[PDB]
């Protein structure tokens, strides 16, 4: 199938409680494979996938050094952004970034990503061309100027097209038994009386990987989008995910309702009904 690698970085200032915490977490699809945390008591702890451990101390030493430099850079960037927004030194602020690459089944680049948010708001992003920037406001235009002057996009392009793709391919090979395995949802429908007059039908999907899934209810073959309660897909803790979708149905009309499930691990999409 297709795959992605993405790092999710968070720098958080905490005036009066030390230097800003910096955490960088790496994922292949929905699998976390590395974590670096400036608050780590012992580097012996920062968790990593078994297939990362096999890369040895050279890989770990190089990545640890990159993380340490990234910590310094984002801390300074936090300082600069506080200034760009005329903010007091007293408040806590957050700088986040996401970067990485999407590849197809053939392992070829689909597109790259490198973008940033400040206090939860989009700030600057590398465009799909991997050459130009989109700045959200006059503050981010300053960052854009600095990054154009230093040719940062060219470095990021080289990473996204080269390093990112090559390492994603390597991780997929080393972790193939998990990373290239899609686990289909285990599905069933439950029935929950509300009153004499109506009941909830809940369609369940359990144990699936990756997280992407489509779960819908139809009534007489018509999508019930507005009438469906659909919970966010949620992690089970064993790598897999769960989701449900529910509709309120008049007593006696249950068989007019069908649940539809689509997921990468299914050879065929499912159609389910309440089975009393």
């Amino acid at each position: 199938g297709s795959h992605s690698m993405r790092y999710f970085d968070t720098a958080m200032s905490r005036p009066g409680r030390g230097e800003p915490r910096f955490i960088s977490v790496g994922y292949v699809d929905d699998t976390q494979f590395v974590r670096f945390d400036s608050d780590a008591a012992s580097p012996r702890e920062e968790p990593r996938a078994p297939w990362i451990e096999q890369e040895g101390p050279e890989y770990w030493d190089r990545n640890t050094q990159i993380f340490k430099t990234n910590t310094q850079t984002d801390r300074e960037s936090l300082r600069n952004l506080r200034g760009y927004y005329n903010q007091s030194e007293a408040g806590s602020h957050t700088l986040q970034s996401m970067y990485g690459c999407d590849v197809g089944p053939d392992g070829r680049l689909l597109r790259g990503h490198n973008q940033y948010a400040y206090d939860g708001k989009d700030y600057i992003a590398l465009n799909e061309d991997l050459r130009s920037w989109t700045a959200a406001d006059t503050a981010a235009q300053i960052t854009q100027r600095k990054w154009e002057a230093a040719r940062v996009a060219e470095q990021d392009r080289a990473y996204l097209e080269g390093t990112c793709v090559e390492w994603l391919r390597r991780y997929l090979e080393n972790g193939k038994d998990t990373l290239e395995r899609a686990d289909p949802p285990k599905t069933h429908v439950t029935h929950h009386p509300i009153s004499d007059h109506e009941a909830t039908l809940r369609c369940w999907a359990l144990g699936f990987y990756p997280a992407e899934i489509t779960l819908t209810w139809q009534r007489d073959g018509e999508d019930q989008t507005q009438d469906t309660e659909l919970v966010e897909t949620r992690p089970a803790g064993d790598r897999t995910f769960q989701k449900w979708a529910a509709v309120v149905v008049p007593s006696g009309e249950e068989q007019r309702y069908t649940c539809h499930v689509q997921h990468e691990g299914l050879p065929k999409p499912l159609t389910l009904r309440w089975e009393p």
């Binding site: 790092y7 790496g26 993380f67 430099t69 990234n70 850079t73 600095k146 470095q155 390093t163």
Partner: peptide
């Protein structure tokens, strides 16, 4: 593999 952040924003 981490990307190198070098230039302050």
């Amino acid at each position: 593999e981490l990307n190198r952040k070098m230039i302050y924003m």
